[PDB]
Nucleic acid binder design. Structure first.
Lengths: 129, 227, 107, 218, 120, 82
RNA sequence: UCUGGUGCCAGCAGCCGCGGUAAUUCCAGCUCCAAUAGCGUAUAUUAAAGUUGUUGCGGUUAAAACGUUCGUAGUUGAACU
RNA sequence: AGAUACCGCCCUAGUUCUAACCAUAAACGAUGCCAGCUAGCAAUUGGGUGUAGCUACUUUUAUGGCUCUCUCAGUCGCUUCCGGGAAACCAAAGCUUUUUGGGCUCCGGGGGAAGUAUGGUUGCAAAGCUGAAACUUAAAGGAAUUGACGGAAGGGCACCA
């Protein structure tokens, strides 16, 4: 059964962009995963998505551009401090030019460029480039 | 070094001979096939070195009983970012070498090299991490930082000095003791270097000029006219 | 390697299915792994039929037909040439052809 | 706007069976169907073809050399409308076989370098359309509502089965390609009537004498 | 018993379709003699194999000619072909007999909302 | 790929698709660059310059380049009346 | 693809392979190449090994989904503040 | 030649039913289970809902049969991916990106010796579930290709038939 909403709405994005659709329907939008796309929205990768509010769990109809290459989740959510945050950017992201590993730090859900200046650590929540 | 100048049998080989374009990347920009081998040694060829890799025999069982085709692997390359493999079997080893060089001069593909975390001083190795398959052998390519001399087997060692890349880390999954399928698995990676959508390329662009339609009724002539 | 996606035939949602007996061989081969021939035959060859319709007292007496089903061992239907050794692309064709003649196997 | 519906040649749509299609609807092509009646038949939106015939007019033009723009119908029912597309234009017609590779070979002397194929029916001769994706050439096409739309743009949904249908808008595609940089003075009614572009007969059915004569003597 | 003229007799058999369509006729002994000047046959007794074919060629040609040849008049009868039947158009001119529901198609699509008719 | 003084010096810029923005490779031999010109309002008087669309091979090989121009043509003013 | 010797012999060779009175592989002469006050051999051990796989394998046919389903320990668990 | 065989005859334990035991099969889809996604095309099993679509006749209606049109859970079938794989091939055997990540469980680590020896456990027995090493070995194996061109079918040829 769904042991992640974040996997069952990020492979569902990634399977629908390798075919090049312009809109993906994800289900059922935990507020964990809205603030994951909001990290991806403000770096260009995702269009302005829409949350259909049925009072069961929710649905989102997410617009997208086509700049995405691989937007997956890491499970289980490994607690990452600040000193071992670069062992998870080296072996994961394609180059240190671009890409992000999203963290759920103690302050909020943020990527690995904003967390290393704000000096926060947390768990790995997923990645996109 | 012609020494006898040859006629352009194709269309854009005449445009090359007409001087309609002086940009090899203009062919690569619209992805139209270089079909005759006399195109690129007009654009390139100034001591552009190639070396054979692999000329081991290949047999076939007949009635009386086993006859050999010698298959050659030649690798041609521009040290400012162009590459090619030659794959051609023949009767004997002289025309195996020379016949594949034409195939090596037709598979010539540009190489994208770039930076990793520091935009300083002549883009070096690779923009990202790429890989390519052909028959079980995968080769990931890692952007190595500056002055980190080539980390690979001798088959892509001689191949990536011909590619305009500073240095590389690589991790070759598969049966790489087949010295010909190793070489062809590197090229699917390097051809993907201009197929990865970096955020360096998110602007729209000037859309191109359509070299057919821009040079259209200057080919309404029926003559094979050069300069 | 797996030479057919069917294997024999029709073994899906069963597990295991009943066997029948071959005719020429008298094997015990499955019902679905069986060359079946629902043979309809005229009784009197339709060439000696005019000898018999001479002796018919009634309205020339339209003749009854013979009806049987020929459950076949696979190794004893290739041997009797109901089926033969197709090509690997012709292996995949099931329904074609009828498309031959008038009534066969009678003769 | 006089790229409008233009009633003066919409009545010919209704006779030449251009408003019908197959029972196969082809999941890439349901924006072109308007409704499916009884008998499983499809009344296709020929009004959507109106914008696409003008788009087919816009697609051939802006090519300054109209010699390398090719019209093809390999199946014999449309092999007359392909030939008289060249009596108007500079377009090369080819009917019948191709010798593949008709584009992807250079030792041969029968190779061509076109820029935009015009195939009458793609499922009949997609075997050169498969050659038409090695040399960066678009394939415009007329399509029935069942067609394999691999590599083709732009499909045009009329009927593509009857001889009166393929005869009709092959002339209408020949119409606005000469309204577009052909300058026939603003769609004056043609010397060429609506089916000189036509398949002559079901060959060889009923065919009397030449110059359209009736039967005067008994 | 070949039952067609077998080996490579199209050195002459498809040069006489347009280059020598005339300059011969159905007589076999005439075109026995016209072959000697049109090509230098270096050893002659090949001559009647590449002459005797016209008995089969022109017979196949003058009634229902077969594929792959041109006579400069086999569809230069296209000049006597262009039948213009008056008046090939919408003869009913609107038209009335249609697919029994496509009036409502051409209500929304079309202004021309003329007389109609339907059959099932 | 930039350097110190802001420079695209890689070798060139590859094209991108018009309806999907996928990059057209060096050996995408099934890449169409169609050129479509509109008219002066009623009919005629053909302008220069084409409202040019480009489509990679993988959109054609899955076969919806038919529609991929059709609704590009809606917004761009090429084709109305759907 | 040196010169004499021997002739499935003597022997060599980590593996592949050599040798059966022309041996590029033996034994010697004449040379040559590697590292160099060094270097060879044996055992162990790490890397090689994406052949132990957390990063990171494989399980239709190459080795490998329990015959079947229940089921406790265990491991994992929808959204919501 | 041999024939403890194939072929042929009567047959015994067995097949049969009951009440127990046994616990293995190529027990196979050589493919664990729950979950999300990704495509066409055609059939059918089951249920639902609009077709005065037809249609059996109490009168048409109520029903039944089918018709096309939907719709669930699928299962078959075939076609190829933006799929994948060494291939054979597979809408999963794909989404195992550029060593990746939904969760859980079982199993393998060259070939033999060997599912042997031994201990333990189950069993009335047969046997089952567990399960090594010594020594030996440079290959065993998989999917495909060309020849070989044989109780392999097909189509043909010859007085060295």
């Amino acid at each position: 059964v769904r042991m992640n909403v974040l996997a069952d709405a990020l492979k569902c994005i990634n399977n629908a962009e390798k075919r090049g659709k312009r809109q993906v329907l994800l289900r059922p939008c935990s507020k964990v995963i809205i603030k994951f796309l909001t990290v991806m929205m403000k770096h260009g990768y995702i269009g302005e998505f829409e949350i259909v509010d049925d009072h069961r769990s929710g649905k989102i109809v997410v617009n997208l551009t086509g700049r995405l290459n691989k937007c997956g989740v890491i499970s289980p959510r490994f607690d990452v401090p600040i000193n071992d945050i670069e062992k998870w950017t080296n072996n994961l992201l394609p180059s240190r030019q671009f890409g992000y590993v999203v963290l759920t730090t103690s302050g909020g859900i943020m990527d690995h460029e904003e967390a290393r200046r704000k000096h926060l650590g947390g768990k790995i929540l997923g990645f996109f480039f | 070094e012609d020494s006898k100048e040859w006629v352009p049998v194709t269309k854009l080989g005449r445009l090359v001979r007409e001087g309609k374009i002086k940009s090899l990347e203009e062919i690569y920009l619209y992805s139209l096939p270089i079909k005759e081998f006399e195109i690129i040694d007009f654009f390139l060829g100034s001591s552009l070195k190639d070396e054979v890799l692999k000329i081991m025999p290949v047999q076939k069982q007949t009635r009386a009983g086993q006859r050999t085709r010698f298959k050659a692997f030649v690798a041609i390359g521009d040290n400012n970012g162009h590459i090619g493999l030659g794959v051609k079997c023949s009767k004997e080893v002289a025309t195996a070498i020379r016949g594949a060089i034409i195939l090596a001069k037709l598979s010539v593909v540009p190489v994208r090299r770039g930076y990793w975390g520091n935009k300083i001083g002549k883009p070096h190795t690779v923009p990202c991490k790429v890989t390519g398959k052909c028959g079980s052998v995968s080769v990931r390519l890692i952007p190595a930082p500056r002055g980190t001399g080539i980390v690979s087997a001798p088959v892509p060692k001689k191949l990536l000095t011909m590619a305009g890349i500073e240095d590389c880390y690589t991790s070759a999954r598969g049966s790489t003791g087949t010295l010909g399928n190793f070489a062809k698995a590197t090229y699917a990676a390097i051809a993907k270097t201009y197929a990865y959508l970096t955020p360096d390329l998110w602007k729209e662009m000037p859309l191109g000029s359509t070299p057919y339609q821009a040079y259209s009724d200057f080919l309404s002539k029926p003559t094979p006219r050069l300069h | 390697t797996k030479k057919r996606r069917n294997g024999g035939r029709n073994k899906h949602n069963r597990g295991h299915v009943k066997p029948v007996r071959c005719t020429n061989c008298a094997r015990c081969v499955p019902k679905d792994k069986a060359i079946k021939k629902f043979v309809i035959r005229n009784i009197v060859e339709a060439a000696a039929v005019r000898d018999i319709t001479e002796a018919s007292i009634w309205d020339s007496y339209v003749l009854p037909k013979l009806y049987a089903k020929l459950h076949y061992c696979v190794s004893c239907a290739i041997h009797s040439k109901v089926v033969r050794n197709r090509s690997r692309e012709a292996r995949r064709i099931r329904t074609p052809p009828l498309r031959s003649f008038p009534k066969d196997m009678a003769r | 706007d006089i790229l409008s519906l233009k009633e003066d040649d919409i009545t010919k749509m209704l006779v030449a069976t251009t408003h019908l299609g197959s029972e196969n609807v082809n999941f890439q092509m349901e924006q072109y169907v308007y409704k499916r009646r009884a008998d499983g038949v499809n009344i296709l939106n020929l009004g959507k073809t109106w914008e696409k015939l003008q788009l087919a007019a816009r697609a051939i033009v802006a090519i300054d050399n109209p010699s390398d723009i090719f019209v093809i119908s390999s199946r014999p029912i449309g092999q007359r409308a392909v030939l008289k597309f060249a009596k108007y234009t500079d377009t090369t017609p080819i009917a019948g076989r191709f010798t593949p590779g008709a584009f992807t070979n250079q030792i041969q002397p029968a190779f061509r370098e076109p820029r935009l194929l015009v195939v009458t029916d793609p499922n009949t001769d997609h075997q050169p359309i498969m050659e038409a994706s090695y040399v960066n050439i678009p394939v415009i096409a007329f399509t029935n509502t069942d067609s394999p739309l691999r590599y083709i743009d732009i499909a045009i949904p009329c009927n593509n089965k009857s001889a009166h249908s393929i005869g009709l808008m092959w002339w209408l595609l020949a119409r606005e390609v000469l309204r577009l940089r052909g300058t026939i003075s603003r769609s004056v009614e043609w010397p060429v009537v609506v089916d000189l572009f036509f398949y002559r007969d079901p060959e060889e059915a009923e065919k009397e004498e030449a110059a359209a004569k009736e039967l005067l003597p008994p | 018993m070949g039952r067609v003229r077998t080996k490579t007799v199209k050195k002459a058999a498809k040069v006489i379709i347009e280059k020598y369509y005339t300059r011969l006729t159905l007589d076999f002994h005439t075109n026995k003699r016209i072959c000697e000047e049109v090509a230098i046959i270096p050893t002659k007794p090949l001559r009647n194999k590449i002459a005797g074919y016209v008995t089969h060629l022109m017979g196949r040609l003058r009634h229902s000619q077969v594929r792959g040849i041109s006579i400069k008049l086999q569809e230069e009868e296209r000049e006597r072909r262009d039948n213009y039947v008056p008046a090939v158009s919408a003869l009913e001119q609107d038209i009335i007999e249609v697919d029994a529901d496509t009036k409502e198609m051409l209500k929304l699509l079309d202004f021309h909302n003329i007389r109609g008719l339907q059959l099932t | 790929m930039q350097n110190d003084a802001g420079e695209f010096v890689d070798l060139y810029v590859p094209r991108k698709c018009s309806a999907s923005n996928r990059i057209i490779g060096a050996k995408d031999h099934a890449s169409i660059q169609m050129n479509v010109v509109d008219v002066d309002p009623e009919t005629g008087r053909q302008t220069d310059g084409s409202k040019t669309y480009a489509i990679c091979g993988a959109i054609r090989r899955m076969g919806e380049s038919d529609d991929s121009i059709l609704r590009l043509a809606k917004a761009d003013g090429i084709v109305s009346k759907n």
